[PDB]
Amino acid sequence: GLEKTVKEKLSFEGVGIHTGEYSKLIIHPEKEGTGIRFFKNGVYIPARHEFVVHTNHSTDLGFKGQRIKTVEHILSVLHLLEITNVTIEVIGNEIPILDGSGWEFYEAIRKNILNQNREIDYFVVEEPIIVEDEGRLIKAEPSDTLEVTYEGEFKNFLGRQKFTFVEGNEEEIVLARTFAFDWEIEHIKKVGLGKGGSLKNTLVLGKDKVYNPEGLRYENEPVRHKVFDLIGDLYLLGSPVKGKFYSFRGGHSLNVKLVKELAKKQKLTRDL
Numbered sequence: 001g002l003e004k005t006v007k008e009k010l011s012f013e014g015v016g017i018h019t020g021e022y023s024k025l026i027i028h029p030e031k032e033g034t035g036i037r038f039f040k041n042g043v044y045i046p047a048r049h050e051f052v053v054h055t056n057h058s059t060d061l062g063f064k065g066q067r068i069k070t071v072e073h074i075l076s077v078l079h080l081l082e083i084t085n086v087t088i089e090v091i092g093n094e095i096p097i098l099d100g101s102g103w104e105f106y107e108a109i110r111k112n113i114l115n116q117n118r119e120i121d122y123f124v125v126e127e128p129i130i131v132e133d134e135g136r137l138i139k140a141e142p143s144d145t146l147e148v149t150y151e152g153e154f155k156n157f158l159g160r161q162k163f164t165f166v167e168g169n170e171e172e173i174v175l176a177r178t179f180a181f182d183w184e185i186e187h188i189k190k191v192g193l194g195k196g197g198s199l200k201n202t203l204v205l206g207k208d209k210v211y212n213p214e215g216l217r218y219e220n221e222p223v224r225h226k227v228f229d230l231i232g233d234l235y236l237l238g239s240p241v242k243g244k245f246y247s248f249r250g251g252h253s254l255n256v257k258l259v260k261e262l263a264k265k266q267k268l269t270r271d272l
């Protein structure tokens with residue numbers, strides 16, 4: 001498809017899930033060849049793996065002393081809509097979490113797309129690859145379309161779940177919310193994170209129950225969200241991606257490990 005930007009500036013705002021601080025975004029149109037980048041305090045931070053500074057419970061980027069936490073959800077939405085040129089100005093320290101899903105970003109951006117004049121140079125996975133870490137695994141292989149499967153094995157009533165995204169089914173993952181388990185939240189807070197987490201933006205699960213009065217949006221909401229996360233992290237390759245991916249219990253750290261291995265393989269087709 002064609003490279004795309006946004007027609008008009010778009011703004012979003014609200015608390016960040018990890019900092020608990022209120023932040024604001026302004027998404028700016030950009031010309032062909034710009035790529036996706038963030039902007040904070042006069043500094044541009046490209047949405048690329050080289051700028052990753054943290055991957056525990058979120059994917060965070062930084063450059064020249066400026067940091068932005070939790071880029072994965074806005075990047076996933078941009079990846080899914082194939083927005084390729086845009087500046088995300090951040091006033092604050094984190095992307096707003098909103099309702100925990102990509103829905104608000106997705107609906108607003110989808111109605112505000114501007115087609116541009118050259119085609120997208122997709123990052124096309126050229127051969128099979130597997131990355132592993134402590135029982136977790138992610139595999140990628142060539143595909144003309146983006147296909148992403150996540151399989152989880154949860155230590156509560158959910159047990160084993162898997163979900164597969166394919167192109168055309170974007171609406172199946174952009175409403176799936178971030179989630180946490182009650183027995184893990186104390187640790188997360190103790191290590192300086194989750195300060196903005198609440199039942200308003202997080203699906204909170206116990207061994208045998210759901211805390212949110214509204215319940216789950218889908219019986220497999222957690223693995224839908226994990227697919228959504230992975231698609232955001234994959235955009236750190238710097239272009240929309242064509243490939244078939246399977247993640248078993250993956251998280252941001254493993255996702256970024258995969259991205260870095262893929263990028264290394266193709267640095268001399270991509271940089272040209």
Ligand SMILES: C[C@@H](O)[C@H](NC(=O)c1ccc(C#CC#Cc2ccccc2)cc1)C(=O)NO
Pocket residue numbers: 017057058059072073178179180185188194197198199202204225226229
């Ligand atoms: C999903 C995973 O990949 C990941 N999310 C997290 O790791 C995470 C961690 C903690 C919290 C939280 C919280 C809370 C709370 C709370 C609620 C009610 C009362 C008191 C505290 C949310 C997300 C994620 O979505 N990355 O994109």
Ligand SMILES: [Zn+2]
Pocket residue numbers: 072073178225229
């Ligand atoms: Zn997430």
